[PDB]
Design a protein around this ligand. Structure first.
Ligand SMILES: Cc1cc2c(cc1C)N(C[C@H](O)[C@H](O)[C@H](O)COP(=O)(O)O)c1[nH]c(=O)[nH]c(=O)c1N2
Ligand SMILES: Cc1cc2c(cc1C)N(C[C@H](O)[C@H](O)[C@H](O)COP(=O)(O)O)c1[nH]c(=O)[nH]c(=O)c1N2
Ligand code: SF4
Ligand code: SF4
Ligand code: FES
Ligand code: FES
Ligand SMILES: [Cl-]
Ligand SMILES: [Cl-]
Ligand SMILES: [Cl-]
Ligand code: NA
Ligand code: NA
Ligand code: NA
Ligand code: NA
Ligand code: NA
Ligand code: NA
Ligand code: NA
Ligand code: NA
Ligand code: NA
Ligand code: NA
Ligand code: NA
Ligand code: NA
Ligand code: NA
Ligand code: NA
Ligand code: NA
Ligand code: NA
Lengths: 418, 156, 419, 156
């Protein structure tokens, strides 16, 4: 018995990551095994760690956590440093609009576990962590139970399947901070401290948990690994466009008919995501904007872009929040400002005061209480959150809002007169 | 002085023994404490600090940093209401209205019986089912007042 | 050193003795065993007289785990009444349907078994010991060969073990497909390089066994207890479970339960507790219709509150628990039992040879709806007449389970006779 | 006349020298022979008998008695399928059907290439993991055809 969870809709054209997770329930080890589960693990343990790294590299797999970094390359960087090494599954998923990782965790936990074991073996880590956000309690209990199932079937512990490889997976819980998804803050949290990002370099792959080489990978990234081993890298790379190959999860929300998670190839366009897969808009209203989480704002003129990690592609985590013609962009922008206000960790001065002032002033603007100085100040602070920032949050806290100022000037002007 | 009840102390010791190093268990322990008491009592932090072999200073800082922990109000059930972009767009305000009609309280307030506290939170990662709320560990889509009323009736 | 693939049988203990290590599904080698205090019982034993060790095992109330529940100390006493040389045999033939308890000690904690064999061999004055492992346990065989070499290298086997003047070699023999080779006299015949044909008893092995010499045959589980009795003393051992049926017992549970596996439990546990409290209840929460005690007995759902002990009203045997639920066809299940005995009679005794064959042949016709009235009456007759003139336990019990199903599930059988 | 290859005769000699008496090694020798040739050649038994210092018909009787030994069919891989009660109850027939779909044979049969033989056996002592099968020495639980197919592709 687990806590109640809403039954998020899930749909796939590829039947890989969502092969089981398209059905909204826990799939336990027996169902997983019936689908040929843990056979990729068995094949992996008959390969050298170095061969596994090579396969993941050649697959073109990129991280699903936002930065799109080539996963094989990350692993290679870690293993060039002396052991011991650590492997961390980032299940902090707290960016607005983003709910792709939880359906893997909650419905097909063994897919994730199998990926963690193969990955840990690949980089020579004997201890792995899942850091799951505190607001996913069901995920936490489901993962603990799945780990025990795996122990019982001999997929975890010492000398796994007679290979000589030892692994324990520890499940840690967050406690309400979005910044703990940032890889260095996540590590600080795992060490029992406040989630404060660290100055990089060094990067975790060189000095991470307890100062040792550490690979941090997102849930979705890791869930690809069993497929790469099972199919082989060459067959995986046949999926979708050859430069951005394999499945991608797209969490779609807001004013669409069928909000939920879609498993699609990355040559899919944003227009197709909204209109072909997600069933179009509520009431068939015109699309006004798409927010890529709390990161970017695309206009209705930018819907024909690929959902890949190219320069002109959508990128990020594939998070798609749809606003239609009657939605107030300034009200929306305020919500984004409020998010960053609540999540800055405060270490860096322009980020600390800038995220606060951005939300404070924008609220005044929205409520029609802003002076001329508040207007000029809002503009200034929006452009000055980034300086001296040591992590991605400070770098992006002004970005979406700046884009709404550029793309929807007429809506902002209505508030200025107000 | 303050002492942890035996059933609680057992759980705490289990968490402390779970990871390779004791101090890694700090968040799990604090979750456990808040679960047990309905809040983090300030008096609890000194003995937890000792169990973790950490300075009290360190523990206090950690409690203050993480938004889920609450040192101020005891509540049996925390109603976490998402106030982020997607939920807002799809009807957070109607949920808050329904909550006020049913419980008589606004965000940040506790019912006079100590039973329910409304806690505004950032995105709960269920945006496709907006507007979202949790009641302790249980998570739900808000549909209507009649539906919310039925859901809350399960928490006694 | 890689071994053949083995399925990872689930194991759970409330006592943490026999399954302290074997609850984890992997080979525990000697260094890991030593870290847990392994082989200290052997050292203690070698500082005791053989007679004192027999006396402790007697006072422990240890009974055999191979099906008969014979008191182990008593057996050893019988053997040492007879002039040496003597032989010690570990019975690892485990081939009864439902029974997979022994293999997890062999495959996961072999040094527990080896330590037990050394102490046992010392107690009865045997300088040569044998493990007879069924042929269908190839992994167990290779794991045991390697463990014996590890024990030799650390000085626990060979000549003059730990300066005691006690010499021991353990030889590992393999079976080749016959269930009957678990019967202690047929095992000995097989060890002598012949067909596994039971001998007429008396004499019993303890008097005349391997090469006609005093021979103690004990089951794997029985032997695995011996290090604990020495380590703890017989008082602390006897404090485990009820004082008349004390100590751990292993229960292999299979069929229609949620958590099939091996349970280490005390013998005051009830059948109902084994199924519902430990094995997680039934698949689909369906009603228990019957439990088969391997291929020996059939308990109905009205008999679930019995203790898992060796009392008259207790479950007994090897503690094998096969669970059938309400939709399981009892006649189909009885056929599988009949087929097992048909395939395993060694054929020496006429009623057993012809009876096991006819019971199967006739029950198949009944099952397929092709039995004449004479086939029906013949089935009943032959089921009651397998036992006469039998010289081993197989002939004595080949009809027992099937008879119980006729007595306890008449309505199900009647449906077949009508059709 | 038939003569063992040297490397085999070495192993037979190892077994014969292992026990205190030569004749005790008869079953280890027969396993070794069957491992080597994929069956017990009828013509192998005479020279085995000589090394064991046993009459030929003693050896013949032992081969006849023990069900694991096969004098009729050469097979590289023996797929031993348990047909006893627990496996039957939990899905022997699904396994057999899956084997027929993949390999094209029923129990008792060998593939035309001589690679696989299905051998029905009594309880394999793994009843909690029913339905059980072996491929030579390796033992597995059958879960599904997809799972079985991947296992068998490991034997070339
Ligand atoms: C403020 C902030 C917050 C987050 C991140 C970054 C920043 C700047 N990152 C990205 C994270 O640091 C890292 O890039 C990935 O976890 C690496 O895994 P992949 O390469 O994407 O598999 C991140 N990653 C993730 O997997 N889940 C999350 O919730 C977050 N959150
Ligand atoms: C047909 C048949 C088959 C078996 C047995 C009996 C009979 C009648 N016995 C029991 C065996 O003869 C003997 O009682 C025990 O091995 C003695 O050891 P314990 O006193 O139980 O430790 C038996 N015992 C055992 O340890 N393993 C086995 O597989 C079998 N199989
Ligand atoms: S940029 Fe902002 S969130 Fe990141 S470390 Fe600096 S203050 Fe903290
Ligand atoms: S009773 Fe049956 S199995 Fe036992 S010796 Fe006689 S014929 Fe053989
Ligand atoms: S915006 Fe409310 S759950 Fe994501
Ligand atoms: S009944 Fe098949 S392994 Fe026991
Ligand atoms: Cl508002
Ligand atoms: Cl001593
Ligand atoms: Cl001859
Ligand atoms: Na879910
Ligand atoms: Na560790
Ligand atoms: Na909880
Ligand atoms: Na968090
Ligand atoms: Na990274
Ligand atoms: Na917000
Ligand atoms: Na099991
Ligand atoms: Na020792
Ligand atoms: Na003594
Ligand atoms: Na085992
Ligand atoms: Na000898
Ligand atoms: Na045998
Ligand atoms: Na030896
Ligand atoms: Na047999
Ligand atoms: Na009746
Ligand atoms: Na077996």
């Amino acid at each position: 018995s687990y806590p109640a969870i809403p039954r998020i809709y899930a749909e796939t054209t590829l039947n890989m990551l969502l092969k089981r997770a398209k059905k909204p329930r826990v799939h336990s080890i027996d169902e997983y095994l019936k689908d040929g589960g843990y056979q990729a693990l068995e094949k992996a343990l008959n390969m050298s760690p170095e061969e596994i790294i090579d396969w993941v590299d050649k697959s073109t797999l990129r991280g699903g956590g936002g930065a799109g970094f080539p996963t094989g390359k990350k692993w290679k960087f870690a293993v060039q440093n002396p052991g011991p090494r650590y492997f961390i599954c980032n299940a902090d998923e707290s960016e607005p609009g983003t709910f792709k990782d939880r359906i893997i965790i909650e419905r097909d936990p063994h897919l994730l576990i199998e990926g963690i074991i193969i990955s840990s073996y690949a980089i020579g880590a004997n201890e792995a962590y899942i850091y799951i956000r505190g607001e996913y309690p069901a995920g936490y209990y489901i993962l603990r139970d799945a780990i025990e199932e795996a122990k019982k079937k001999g997929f975890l512990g010492k000398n796994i399947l007679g290979s000589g490889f030892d692994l324990e997976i520890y499940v840690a819980r967050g406690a309400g901070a979005y910044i703990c998804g940032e890889e260095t803050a996540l590590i600080e949290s795992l060490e029992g401290k406040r989630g404060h990002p660290r100055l990089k370099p060094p990067y975790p792959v060189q000095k991470g948990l307890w100062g040792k080489p550490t690979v941090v990978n997102n849930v979705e990234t890791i869930a690809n690994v069993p497929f790469i081993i099972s199919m082989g890298w060459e067959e995986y790379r046949y999926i979708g466009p050859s430069d951005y190959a394999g499945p991608k999860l797209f969490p779609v929300s807001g004013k669409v008919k069928k909000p939920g998670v879609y498993e699609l190839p990355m040559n899919t366009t944003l227009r197709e995501v909204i209109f072909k897969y997600a069933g179009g808009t509520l009431g068939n209203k015109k699309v006004k904007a798409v927010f890529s989480g709390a990161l970017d704002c695309f206009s209705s003129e930018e819907l024909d872009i690929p959902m890949d990690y190219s320069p002109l592609g959508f990128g990020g985590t594939g998070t798609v929040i749809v606003l239609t013609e009657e939605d107030d962009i300034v009200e929306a922008a305020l919500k984004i400002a409020e998010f960053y206000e609540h999540e800055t960790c405060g270490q860096c001065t322009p980020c600390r005061v800038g995220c606060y002032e951005q939300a404070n002033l924008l609220e005044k603007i929205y409520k029609g209480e802003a002076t001329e100085q508040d207007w000029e100040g809002f503009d200034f602070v929006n452009r000055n959150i980034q300086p001296t920032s040591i992590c991605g949050l400070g770098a992006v806290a002004g970005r979406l809002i700046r884009q709404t100022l550029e793309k929807f000037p007429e809506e902002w002007e209505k508030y200025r007169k107000k | 002085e303050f002492e942890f009840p035996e059933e609680l102390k057992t759980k705490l010791q289990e968490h402390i023994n779970y990871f390779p190093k004791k101090r890694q268990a700090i968040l799990l322990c604090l979750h456990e404490i808040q679960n047990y008491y309905g809040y983090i009592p300030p008096e609890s932090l000194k003995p937890l600090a000792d169990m973790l072999e950490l300075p009290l200073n360190h523990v206090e800082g950690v409690v203050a940093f993480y938004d889920m922990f609450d040192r101020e109000d005891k509540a049996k059930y925390r109603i976490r209401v998402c106030v982020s972009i997607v939920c807002h767009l799809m009807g957070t305000n109607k949920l808050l209205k329904a909550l006020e009609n049913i419980l008589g309280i606004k965000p940040g307030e506790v019912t006079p019986d100590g039973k329910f506290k409304i806690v505004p939170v950032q995105c709960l990662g269920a945006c496709s089912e907006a507007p979202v709320f949790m009641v302790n560990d249980d998570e739900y889509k808000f549909e209507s007042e009649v539906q919310l009323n039925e859901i809350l009736s399960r928490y006694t």
